[model samples]
Target: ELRFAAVGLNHNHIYGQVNCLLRAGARLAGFHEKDDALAAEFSAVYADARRIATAEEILEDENIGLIVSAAVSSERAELAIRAMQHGKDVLVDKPGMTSFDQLAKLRRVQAETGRIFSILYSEHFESPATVKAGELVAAGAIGEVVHIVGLGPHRLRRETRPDWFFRRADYGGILTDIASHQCEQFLFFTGVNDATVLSASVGNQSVPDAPELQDTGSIHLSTGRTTGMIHVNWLTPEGMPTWGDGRLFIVGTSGTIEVRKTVDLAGREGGNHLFLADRNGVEHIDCSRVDLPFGRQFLADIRDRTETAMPQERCFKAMELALQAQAIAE
Candidate 1:
């Protein structure tokens, strides 16, 4: 049986991750948080199923086989490294670490520990539309992929953030926070092992109250095989459809694929709804029909000792490329 421990509290994604794990019949060894209010909320939600503890305490537990490092991006790498050092596999949240250097160190620790260290890029695996696109691309239906244009735009909240998130020296920036998803998708579609940012431009047009972090940016990436462009901005007006944040345009040698999904100012979404068009015609891929979380796929890969939707090595490469893009955007 897979026994797991969770770190971090009151973050939006924690509830979903915790609930999903419990639903999968996995044992929740314990949970931890530094925020008392957040801990109280978690205790209320999870009740006796999860007990509150410190991160170090949970990592040192020999019975825990998997550690879910759901903490802030600022501490995710250090926590993951500690978990690996304690001989536990890890499933960390996205923008796993702020910089490539941190990720490199974690990679080294992972190699030494010889444990599964997976970062959650759940968007790609969770979106049925993206899954369909990957299937088509794999089948050679789109021929050779040439270029991709993606847009991710939403409103910015004036509400204050945790100090670390607002400063580049701590949590990286919006490019790492928001645009990493686009970079992951680019790597996904092209099946490219590595990518590099050719150029980028960024600005803090929105939320004049928060000037240190950029709210808008555009990135250009070149993978030896394909060129991709991504535009991200925090400028959508209120009351738009939740799934209307943006879409992806993939141009291939023979056809094209377009995906439209809604996102909120905080990067939350209802579900991914997508439309696909090729030389043959256009069709809607039903995203609602997909039921599995991306984490479950990772578990399956571990059990089978085979590659899942996203492999660790590939994700590592994507992070390197994403950090490069973040640097250029800065």
Candidate 2:
């Protein structure tokens, strides 16, 4: 059985990670959190899982095969290294690390430990439309992917956000944090293991109160054969229904595909609305019924010692480009 423990539940994305693992038939061995309020809330939802006293207790356990975390962005890389060093695989939230130094350390440790260090890039895996788009693109619905444009706009609820969220060092830069999704998607659809950032920029255009917070960022990158542009920001309008109006566009040789990941302004009931244009005609696919297989595939990878869910090198490259873009922009 695949038994996993949760550590550093500072971000709510930890819930999604835990829920997906549970759905994949992994047992929640235990959890450790320093904040009592956060621990209490998590315990209420996961009554069956024991709330361990310290991170060391969960980290030292031999039975736990995986360690899941959505810790403060700056701390994720170190936590993952510790988990891998202890003979456990790691699945953590995005941005994965704050700096290039951390990335270097992670790369070295992961290679030494031979453990799976997976980042849950929720924008692609959790969005049914994005998943369906990948299937169609692979099936030749779009002849050959040439370029991609991704947009990720998020709401910044200043009052509700934790102090770390406002700190550049803690949250990582805007591109490193949110544009990581686009970088991963670009690699996945373009089928490239590496890409170069053409240009990038970051600035606080709107929220001046939080000086350390970067409210806007953009990146232009290419894999030589394919190209991509990504824009991410924490400026979702107040009237927007969801946190962000996430969108993805793929320009192929013979056709095109667009995904409305979060919301459709055209009075659509919910998100995951896809539009495809080919020689035949423009068709809309409601991806709500599409099955998400990441959870199961990840668990299967652990059991079989395979990279079916996502290639380790590809995962590393995605974040590498993001971090590079962030460095250049800042």
Candidate 3:
């Protein structure tokens, strides 16, 4: 009987997903929304869903065993700590903490409380192509992974964001927001630690007014065992099929594996939006296999007492590197 109290409104998608979980036998301890309209909408989904007027109210709920911290990046550490202190497990959205200091505090609190804390790096879980990439690498289909390349691009010129997104101090910039996911995926596929950013460059060509957010950037990393690179931007043209979201190319001594999310693969009457090439034969993988949405997985972990696909410790390490890369970019 795992009970949950959701925090924040930015991730409104969670409401429907949470409702689905509740109907599937999980318990809803209610949800907390900072925005009144969001709260009203959530209330309509479940009559028993109580509206938490304050974060403290949700944290204080004795029956609540889990807290879904989907708040902004700046507030995640505080909410996570509060949930753990109140004897509740936590499932936080990506870039769990904005800085190393916050990450360290989170680790300390987790140690003191002995509560489960998982970060929602949902992209990998949602993309079966990524899963197949990892599988091929593990199976030695790619031999020894020598270099990995990933791309994360978007049309930020069309994004409707709050002012906080433009302030590095507030949002930890785009690297933390986007590249952290790629870093985690790299680590997951390579199974290597000690990854260090060698050199990098960041800029905002498309949105100079929001230079602090880094509309474009590139990073090079060395894990001592393997090397990797990530290219990120927010200047993709409109109407692009894939919107240039996430793509990967893992080159090994023997072969290479490429994973991408293309609109054409959705079974629509359209051409492929992404392209891949390999010396050996290539395989196309369905993204849905990895698309295990984090909310449902969190509920599953609570029910089964099993581990989440993306645990907090791994996310913390990836975030640490992202913050370090951000500092270097600055």
TM-score, one value per model: 0.90, 0.99, 0.85
RMSD of each: 3.2, 0.8, 3.4
- Tens-place lDDT per residue, model 3, 34-118, is 7887688778877888787788888887888888766767888888898898988887777787887888899899888877877
> In model 3, which runs have C-alpha deviations exceeding 4 angstroms?
12-25, 44-48, 157-159, 264-280, 287-308
Best by lDDT: 2
List of clashing residue pairs for candidate 1: 243-262, 244-262
Candidate 1 lDDT, 8-103, residue by residue in tens: 753455666666667767778788888877778777877775665567778777888888766778678888888888988877767788888898
List per-prediction Cα lDDT, in the order shown: 0.74, 0.92, 0.72
Total clashes, candidate 2? 0
Sorting all predicted structures by lDDT, with the top scorer first, yields 2, 1, 3
Q: What tens digits encode model 2's per-residue C-alpha lDDT throughout 1-330?
A: 899999989999899999988988899989998999999999999999899998988898889999999998999988999999999999999978989899999999999998999999999888899999999999999898999999999998867798899898898898889999999999999997878999999999998889999999999999889999999989999999999999999999999999999899967888989999998999999999998899989999999989989999988898899999989985
**lDDT, model 3:** 0.72
